[PDB]
Amino acid sequence: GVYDYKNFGTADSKALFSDAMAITLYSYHNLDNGFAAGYQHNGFGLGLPATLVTALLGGTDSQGVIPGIPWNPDSEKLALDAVKKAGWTPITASQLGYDGKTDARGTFFGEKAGYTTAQVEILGKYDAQGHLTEIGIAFRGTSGPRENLILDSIGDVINDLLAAFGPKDYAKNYVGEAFGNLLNDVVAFAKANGLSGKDVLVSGHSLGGLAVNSMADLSGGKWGGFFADSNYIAYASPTQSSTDKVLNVGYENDPVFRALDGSTFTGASVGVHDAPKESATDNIVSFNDHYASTAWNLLPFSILNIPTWISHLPTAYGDGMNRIIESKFYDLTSKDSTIIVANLSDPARANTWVQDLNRNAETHKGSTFIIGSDSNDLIQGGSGNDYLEGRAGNDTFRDGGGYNVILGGAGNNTLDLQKSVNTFDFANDGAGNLYVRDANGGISITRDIGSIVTKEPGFLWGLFKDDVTHSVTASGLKVGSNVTQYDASVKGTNGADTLKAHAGGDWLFGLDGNDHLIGGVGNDVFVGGAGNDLMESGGGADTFLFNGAFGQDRVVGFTSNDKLVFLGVQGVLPNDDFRAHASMVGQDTVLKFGGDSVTLVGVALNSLSADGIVIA
Amino acid sequence: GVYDYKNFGTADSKALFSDAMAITLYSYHNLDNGFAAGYQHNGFGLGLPATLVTALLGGTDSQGVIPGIPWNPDSEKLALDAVKKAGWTPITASQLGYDGKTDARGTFFGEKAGYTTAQVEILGKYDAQGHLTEIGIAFRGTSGPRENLILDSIGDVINDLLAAFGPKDYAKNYVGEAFGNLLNDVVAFAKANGLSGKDVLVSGHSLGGLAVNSMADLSGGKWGGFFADSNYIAYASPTQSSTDKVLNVGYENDPVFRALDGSTFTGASVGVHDAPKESATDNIVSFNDHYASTAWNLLPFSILNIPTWISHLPTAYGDGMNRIIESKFYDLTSKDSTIIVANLSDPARANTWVQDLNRNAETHKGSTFIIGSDSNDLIQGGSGNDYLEGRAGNDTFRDGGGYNVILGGAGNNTLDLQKSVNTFDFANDGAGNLYVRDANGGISITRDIGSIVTKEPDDVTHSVTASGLKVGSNVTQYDASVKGTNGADTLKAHAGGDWLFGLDGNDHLIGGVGNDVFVGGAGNDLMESGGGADTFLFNGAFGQDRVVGFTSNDKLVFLGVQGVLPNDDFRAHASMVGQDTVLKFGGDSVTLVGVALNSLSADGIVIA
Ligand SMILES: [Ca+2]
Ligand SMILES: [Ca+2]
Ligand SMILES: [Ca+2]
Ligand SMILES: [Ca+2]
Ligand SMILES: [Ca+2]
Ligand SMILES: [Ca+2]
Ligand SMILES: [Ca+2]
Ligand SMILES: [Ca+2]
Ligand SMILES: [Ca+2]
Ligand SMILES: [Ca+2]
Ligand SMILES: [Ca+2]
Ligand SMILES: [Ca+2]
Ligand SMILES: [Ca+2]
Ligand SMILES: [Ca+2]
Ligand SMILES: [Ca+2]
Ligand SMILES: [Ca+2]
Ligand SMILES: [Ca+2]
Ligand SMILES: [Ca+2]
Ligand SMILES: [Ca+2]
Ligand SMILES: [Ca+2]
Ligand SMILES: [Ca+2]
Ligand SMILES: [Ca+2]
């Protein structure tokens, strides 16, 4: 997964990430609540003034940056309840025996002159006997408490500028200076409780992210090395520590994220600074109204143009990246996977295609993941290989070619093909997969899409065009009396089957179970499915399709005009070709994808060509 | 006067200035009205969010950026009424026979792709019987109509960027490109009405100031050279034309003003860019909450530091610089005079001393003018020479030394000396001038200050009365004086030394062997030392005076007199006429009878 951390594995890293985000969100006390609500209603163009009014004053369902407005919800109570729902309770200065400054919330404040506007939350997770099992340390980003917002933010910005232009390793030392004493009290508290450093989660966003990186940097030599093995997840940090301890997560179109290299100010710092970085997720796009807008992007992308800062906002971090965590495609992703997150306002969502524009970034490589919202989305895949997820809502998908998985989610979803039905072939395994094959042999595996839209020659002999909506049914695509037939098929069962192709060619659908698929002299398309499947060509120009946890298969009779297609399979690093996955075992080429494999019986690896082995 | 232009008088230059400002304000249609009102009430600190709310939504008494809010005033109608009050009526596309774009307000829009977010107002001044007497051309800054504010702003910022980073002559050519056709129609209209180029006033603020400079640069060669002799007054322009035609007015702490050199982007563009410029007023400070704030100023002064743009806002230009125009000290000023304008919010005004911090600027020289607000101000002069003007409200003044004029204005005003009454001498002429001389010899001439505060080891408040400074029944006597009348008087000092006040009229002041202080006043006064170590004080329109018996240990003091350029000394004003040194200050003069110019020392001659 994109958020794998150390050696915790897929599932445990996701749980750690969700805790990091929860404590980070808590540290801002819903300061951006009004902004997120105004944006969602008004967007970022014509509605920008109205969005900014809500950012300041909230409304009846949000609280902006100004406190004490009687019709706003108590957004700070809501942030406290949300952090507790995630399992966390702030730890008091009294429980720590801490002598420094806290406010009425329990937020701890920086310890030295020049750091007095630094804030950190210290939180505890407790088991059912009320024993402490985990400590959360969440540094606040730029900003402070509503009571002192402006003066506190000035002090933060002075710190931000010293990171770039002050003493060498100002950023490294930030946490030592701001919270050196507090962190000794935390070590004592942890030890008193049977905890070590491994039981400590360290997080924060922006300046809070720089703080995560500072702390990792210092954890080797300060506080007795107690935190050397702590967990460090930083959001939208301008800096990266010199250690291997930090997961630096952010949106690539967030101008603050990676602004420094890893604390050095460069030419790039004021512009696009999207060079690959080892500790960082380099290719996650926030598809918001600004990113989508032609007008807004006439302006140079820069940390110095404030409207680009919409991509920095913490709520869209929490909301977008939670959708990545929940994605049915999550375990296909890796640290530098290209992921586009649908983050449009309500008005923009209704008329803007979520797609990879590749704006203000280095060229995206490998497959592209596009993650929709729980509302009605318009999602556009490119001409390469895409993983499109609609989620809830009535979603519409388009795609420009290649090999794709398209998950409609709940709702009434539609695939608009934008061309004639006659240029496509359609197959259906009866297990909820509708396969769509374009004129170039590109295949989309689709689920939960009930309507197919095509564009057909229309009046005056094709001068005008008809949009035709087809319903996906068991017997084919139907418009009124007109049925578009599925491609000839043989369907198996979820037990062990033997299926035989007819001579004109069939799609063979083994489904679950160890299946024997016998092709003929025709062009057959082999879908072994789950289980360990034996598949024999029979001759012709065959396609073998591998998706998900496809097991250990054997392919007999594979020749030069045949094709393997790996779609939604484990372990594909961005832009892998087959050689990254291929080895000879005796007489056979073996291709491995996670714990799944395909054995090409009798085929020399040296005869194989990227033409006939599609890895998406 | 600081806004002197070409060869126009002081008064004519002022009239031109006030029209330029009025048309410049009109061109923005009160867009920043909500910001000004929120700032006035809430400040720029702790209350900045509430300021920003007002900047967007306005209130019961102002209109922010958002249109159609019913409890807001119709600020655009108010902008139209205001420009008409100043004598101006927008000229229609129809009267000009113009075929390009206007909006419902009569604003003209740029003519070519890349310039479509440019705006300009074309206005007419009509005489009693109603013929065209003047044309006004007001180029809009960054921003446009409330209806399409964001998109129109984005276009303007592209224009702004191209002025710094695009073709070399991009800023020079801006007006040619945006409004070349329109301006040919303006020429035809002006001819049709018996007007030449000298009858055209050209103004605007920010990008509109850039436009003013572009039009002047283009005016010799384009539109038949019709506009070459036009009047060009630009506010807060990042650029300066290559010609000598443009008066570039701005606040020195406005980071847009002079950001470019005249259109070149330099290292200084993104920090402090306060090098002296021939076309520009270099030393006018907007003393606002940002400028005053220690916290704010821990951040870099930079056009890229957006909160610094508070000093760029047009309402503070019009309001602050209108107070300069109205100042009793106006005619003492010149283009590069140091002038501090009180521009604080209500809350900051209560606890903040308006003073020359000299922040983010090259070193100020010469005398300093501090212009107050019509509310209660706290005003602090420096250790050098100051002209302090309270205007209305109850004002409190401090001053650090030197030679000063302090104008209390209306209200109950106070001068807080922060030292013991015993370390000062006080004199009063009976004609509203209270003279305060400090232990170092520095003199302050004060008017409409009825209270003096001193420290007596411990504040003590003295009333200024005809018989002395009073604390209840207790009196600090004025220095020995002989008061004249507004007729011609002969006044003679006693041997102990006196302040001699001729007042109006041609007086004969006869000092004695003691230390006298001679104040001839208005009129041509004859003043004779009589011996001792004498001081001769000259202020305002002091006439042509003769000084007899002036020697080595005597002092001349010129304070609030004409023709003093920043940091002038006496040599710029002295010559020999026969056997006498004559010192000349505008139309006024002092003849030192029998005194050789080479015998004079700048320690003996104070020029403020
Ligand atoms: Ca802070
Ligand atoms: Ca990376
Ligand atoms: Ca990238
Ligand atoms: Ca695709
Ligand atoms: Ca959706
Ligand atoms: Ca859906
Ligand atoms: Ca089966
Ligand atoms: Ca199977
Ligand atoms: Ca076959
Ligand atoms: Ca299989
Ligand atoms: Ca074959
Ligand atoms: Ca404009
Ligand atoms: Ca100058
Ligand atoms: Ca200056
Ligand atoms: Ca002074
Ligand atoms: Ca006042
Ligand atoms: Ca006053
Ligand atoms: Ca007299
Ligand atoms: Ca006189
Ligand atoms: Ca004498
Ligand atoms: Ca003498
Ligand atoms: Ca006189």
Tab-separated table of N, CA and C in Angstrom, chain B residues 154-227:
chain	number	residue	atom	x	y	z
B	154	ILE	N	-7.478	37.972	-11.959
B	154	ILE	CA	-6.488	37.036	-12.452
B	154	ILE	C	-5.863	37.597	-13.724
B	155	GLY	N	-6.700	38.043	-14.658
B	155	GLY	CA	-6.218	38.758	-15.841
B	155	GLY	C	-5.277	39.906	-15.521
B	156	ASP	N	-5.648	40.765	-14.555
B	156	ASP	CA	-4.779	41.903	-14.192
B	156	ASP	C	-3.416	41.480	-13.650
B	157	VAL	N	-3.404	40.462	-12.798
B	157	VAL	CA	-2.152	39.893	-12.255
B	157	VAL	C	-1.242	39.360	-13.335
B	158	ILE	N	-1.808	38.696	-14.343
B	158	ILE	CA	-1.007	38.379	-15.549
B	158	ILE	C	-0.361	39.638	-16.184
B	159	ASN	N	-1.149	40.702	-16.375
B	159	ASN	CA	-0.603	41.993	-16.848
B	159	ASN	C	0.536	42.512	-15.924
B	160	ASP	N	0.329	42.409	-14.612
B	160	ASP	CA	1.278	42.851	-13.579
B	160	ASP	C	2.612	42.098	-13.742
B	161	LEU	N	2.501	40.786	-13.926
B	161	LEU	CA	3.641	39.890	-14.056
B	161	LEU	C	4.437	40.171	-15.322
B	162	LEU	N	3.724	40.508	-16.377
B	162	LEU	CA	4.348	40.779	-17.666
B	162	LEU	C	5.112	42.103	-17.640
B	163	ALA	N	4.593	43.064	-16.888
B	163	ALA	CA	5.317	44.313	-16.585
B	163	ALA	C	6.701	44.101	-15.947
B	164	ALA	N	6.845	43.058	-15.122
B	164	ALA	CA	8.109	42.700	-14.478
B	164	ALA	C	8.960	41.669	-15.253
B	165	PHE	N	8.301	40.716	-15.909
B	165	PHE	CA	8.961	39.525	-16.436
B	165	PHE	C	8.789	39.266	-17.921
B	166	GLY	N	8.029	40.112	-18.615
B	166	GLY	CA	7.754	39.926	-20.010
B	166	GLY	C	8.579	40.779	-20.959
B	167	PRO	N	8.023	41.148	-22.103
B	167	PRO	CA	8.782	41.991	-23.007
B	167	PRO	C	9.255	43.249	-22.302
B	168	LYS	N	10.426	43.682	-22.675
B	168	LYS	CA	11.038	44.811	-22.069
B	168	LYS	C	10.143	46.073	-21.965
B	169	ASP	N	9.478	46.392	-23.047
B	169	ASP	CA	8.607	47.543	-23.094
B	169	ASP	C	7.148	47.235	-22.770
B	170	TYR	N	6.830	46.139	-22.101
B	170	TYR	CA	5.438	45.725	-21.887
B	170	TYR	C	4.633	46.799	-21.081
B	171	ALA	N	5.190	47.294	-19.965
B	171	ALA	CA	4.528	48.330	-19.131
B	171	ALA	C	4.367	49.674	-19.893
B	172	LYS	N	5.411	50.124	-20.592
B	172	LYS	CA	5.324	51.273	-21.520
B	172	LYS	C	4.158	51.184	-22.537
B	173	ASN	N	3.987	50.003	-23.116
B	173	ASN	CA	2.976	49.763	-24.148
B	173	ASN	C	1.560	49.398	-23.673
B	174	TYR	N	1.410	49.072	-22.393
B	174	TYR	CA	0.104	48.701	-21.827
B	174	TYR	C	-1.081	49.577	-22.299
B	175	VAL	N	-0.969	50.896	-22.212
B	175	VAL	CA	-2.130	51.719	-22.564
B	175	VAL	C	-2.400	51.685	-24.081
B	176	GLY	N	-1.325	51.688	-24.861
B	176	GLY	CA	-1.405	51.601	-26.324
B	176	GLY	C	-2.223	50.389	-26.726
B	177	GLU	N	-1.922	49.271	-26.081
B	177	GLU	CA	-2.539	48.004	-26.361
B	177	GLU	C	-3.964	47.896	-25.834
B	178	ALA	N	-4.166	48.314	-24.585
B	178	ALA	CA	-5.500	48.250	-23.982
B	178	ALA	C	-6.515	49.267	-24.547
B	179	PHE	N	-6.071	50.494	-24.830
B	179	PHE	CA	-6.984	51.609	-25.110
B	179	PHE	C	-6.541	52.563	-26.231
B	180	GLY	N	-5.712	52.076	-27.144
B	180	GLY	CA	-5.287	52.871	-28.304
B	180	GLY	C	-6.429	53.467	-29.107
B	181	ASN	N	-7.420	52.649	-29.451
B	181	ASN	CA	-8.613	53.137	-30.157
B	181	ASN	C	-9.424	54.162	-29.344
B	182	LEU	N	-9.754	53.794	-28.102
B	182	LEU	CA	-10.482	54.700	-27.208
B	182	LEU	C	-9.840	56.090	-27.132
B	183	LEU	N	-8.515	56.118	-27.010
B	183	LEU	CA	-7.836	57.383	-26.838
B	183	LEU	C	-7.889	58.212	-28.110
B	184	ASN	N	-7.901	57.582	-29.296
B	184	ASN	CA	-8.125	58.371	-30.539
B	184	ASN	C	-9.485	59.042	-30.554
B	185	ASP	N	-10.515	58.344	-30.066
B	185	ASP	CA	-11.845	58.935	-29.886
B	185	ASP	C	-11.884	60.057	-28.843
B	186	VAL	N	-11.130	59.902	-27.758
B	186	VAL	CA	-11.001	60.976	-26.777
B	186	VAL	C	-10.366	62.221	-27.418
B	187	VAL	N	-9.305	62.045	-28.192
B	187	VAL	CA	-8.710	63.171	-28.926
B	187	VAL	C	-9.768	63.918	-29.771
B	188	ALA	N	-10.521	63.175	-30.589
B	188	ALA	CA	-11.569	63.754	-31.459
B	188	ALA	C	-12.620	64.495	-30.633
B	189	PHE	N	-12.980	63.930	-29.491
B	189	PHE	CA	-13.967	64.565	-28.609
B	189	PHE	C	-13.426	65.870	-28.031
B	190	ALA	N	-12.148	65.857	-27.660
B	190	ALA	CA	-11.565	67.026	-27.039
B	190	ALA	C	-11.466	68.163	-28.074
B	191	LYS	N	-11.004	67.835	-29.294
B	191	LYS	CA	-10.947	68.799	-30.408
B	191	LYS	C	-12.355	69.375	-30.665
B	192	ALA	N	-13.336	68.493	-30.859
B	192	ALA	CA	-14.731	68.903	-31.041
B	192	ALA	C	-15.223	69.904	-29.962
B	193	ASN	N	-14.575	69.906	-28.799
B	193	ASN	CA	-15.027	70.750	-27.707
B	193	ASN	C	-14.106	71.931	-27.418
B	194	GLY	N	-13.103	72.133	-28.276
B	194	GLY	CA	-12.174	73.248	-28.152
B	194	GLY	C	-11.062	73.050	-27.133
B	195	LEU	N	-10.827	71.782	-26.754
B	195	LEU	CA	-9.814	71.400	-25.769
B	195	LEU	C	-8.536	70.826	-26.402
B	196	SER	N	-7.361	71.226	-25.899
B	196	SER	CA	-6.104	70.564	-26.241
B	196	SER	C	-5.605	69.633	-25.106
B	197	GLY	N	-4.383	69.126	-25.260
B	197	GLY	CA	-3.805	68.140	-24.331
B	197	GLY	C	-3.653	68.642	-22.909
B	198	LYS	N	-3.216	69.893	-22.759
B	198	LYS	CA	-3.111	70.576	-21.448
B	198	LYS	C	-4.405	70.567	-20.627
B	199	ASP	N	-5.543	70.346	-21.291
B	199	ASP	CA	-6.861	70.252	-20.644
B	199	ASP	C	-7.234	68.812	-20.235
B	200	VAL	N	-6.264	67.910	-20.238
B	200	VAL	CA	-6.532	66.478	-19.954
B	200	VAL	C	-5.778	66.101	-18.682
B	201	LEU	N	-6.507	65.546	-17.716
B	201	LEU	CA	-5.897	65.010	-16.511
B	201	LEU	C	-5.909	63.478	-16.538
B	202	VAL	N	-4.737	62.898	-16.296
B	202	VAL	CA	-4.538	61.462	-16.351
B	202	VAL	C	-4.074	60.966	-14.977
B	203	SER	N	-4.840	60.039	-14.425
B	203	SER	CA	-4.523	59.474	-13.103
B	203	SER	C	-4.911	57.997	-12.980
B	204	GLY	N	-4.632	57.416	-11.806
B	204	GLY	CA	-4.947	56.011	-11.499
B	204	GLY	C	-3.972	55.500	-10.447
B	205	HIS	N	-4.268	54.346	-9.885
B	205	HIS	CA	-3.581	53.807	-8.691
B	205	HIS	C	-3.118	52.395	-9.057
B	206	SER	N	-1.942	51.999	-8.549
B	206	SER	CA	-1.398	50.647	-8.729
B	206	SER	C	-1.133	50.312	-10.216
B	207	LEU	N	-1.731	49.246	-10.747
B	207	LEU	CA	-1.700	48.969	-12.188
B	207	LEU	C	-2.249	50.151	-12.966
B	208	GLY	N	-3.167	50.899	-12.364
B	208	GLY	CA	-3.665	52.142	-12.994
B	208	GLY	C	-2.613	53.254	-12.975
B	209	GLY	N	-1.749	53.243	-11.957
B	209	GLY	CA	-0.585	54.138	-11.936
B	209	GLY	C	0.434	53.711	-12.995
B	210	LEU	N	0.658	52.403	-13.130
B	210	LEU	CA	1.456	51.898	-14.240
B	210	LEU	C	0.941	52.453	-15.575
B	211	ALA	N	-0.381	52.391	-15.762
B	211	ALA	CA	-1.044	52.935	-16.986
B	211	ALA	C	-0.786	54.407	-17.218
B	212	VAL	N	-0.847	55.186	-16.140
B	212	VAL	CA	-0.582	56.612	-16.240
B	212	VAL	C	0.828	56.850	-16.822
B	213	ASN	N	1.802	56.097	-16.297
B	213	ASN	CA	3.181	56.134	-16.743
B	213	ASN	C	3.357	55.620	-18.192
B	214	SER	N	2.600	54.585	-18.565
B	214	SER	CA	2.565	54.048	-19.943
B	214	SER	C	2.035	55.118	-20.920
B	215	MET	N	0.934	55.777	-20.547
B	215	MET	CA	0.360	56.762	-21.421
B	215	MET	C	1.326	57.920	-21.604
B	216	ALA	N	1.967	58.383	-20.530
B	216	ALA	CA	2.955	59.456	-20.676
B	216	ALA	C	4.116	59.038	-21.610
B	217	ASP	N	4.632	57.817	-21.439
B	217	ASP	CA	5.714	57.253	-22.274
B	217	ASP	C	5.316	57.223	-23.772
B	218	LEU	N	4.063	56.887	-24.028
B	218	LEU	CA	3.488	56.799	-25.377
B	218	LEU	C	3.033	58.117	-26.004
B	219	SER	N	2.986	59.188	-25.217
B	219	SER	CA	2.229	60.409	-25.572
B	219	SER	C	2.872	61.359	-26.594
B	220	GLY	N	4.199	61.318	-26.684
B	220	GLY	CA	4.936	62.040	-27.708
B	220	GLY	C	4.655	61.477	-29.100
B	221	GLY	N	4.621	60.153	-29.230
B	221	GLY	CA	4.538	59.492	-30.533
B	221	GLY	C	3.163	59.003	-30.956
B	222	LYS	N	2.284	58.689	-30.012
B	222	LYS	CA	0.973	58.156	-30.377
B	222	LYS	C	-0.088	59.218	-30.240
B	223	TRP	N	-1.281	58.907	-30.784
B	223	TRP	CA	-2.454	59.783	-30.788
B	223	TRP	C	-2.106	61.178	-31.311
B	224	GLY	N	-1.196	61.221	-32.282
B	224	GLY	CA	-0.829	62.488	-32.926
B	224	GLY	C	-0.055	63.408	-31.981
B	225	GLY	N	0.407	62.865	-30.853
B	225	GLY	CA	1.172	63.654	-29.879
B	225	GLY	C	0.291	64.623	-29.112
B	226	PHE	N	-1.021	64.400	-29.210
B	226	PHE	CA	-2.034	65.259	-28.597
B	226	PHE	C	-1.910	65.323	-27.053
B	227	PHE	N	-1.557	64.192	-26.450
B	227	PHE	CA	-1.473	64.085	-24.992
B	227	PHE	C	-0.092	64.428	-24.405
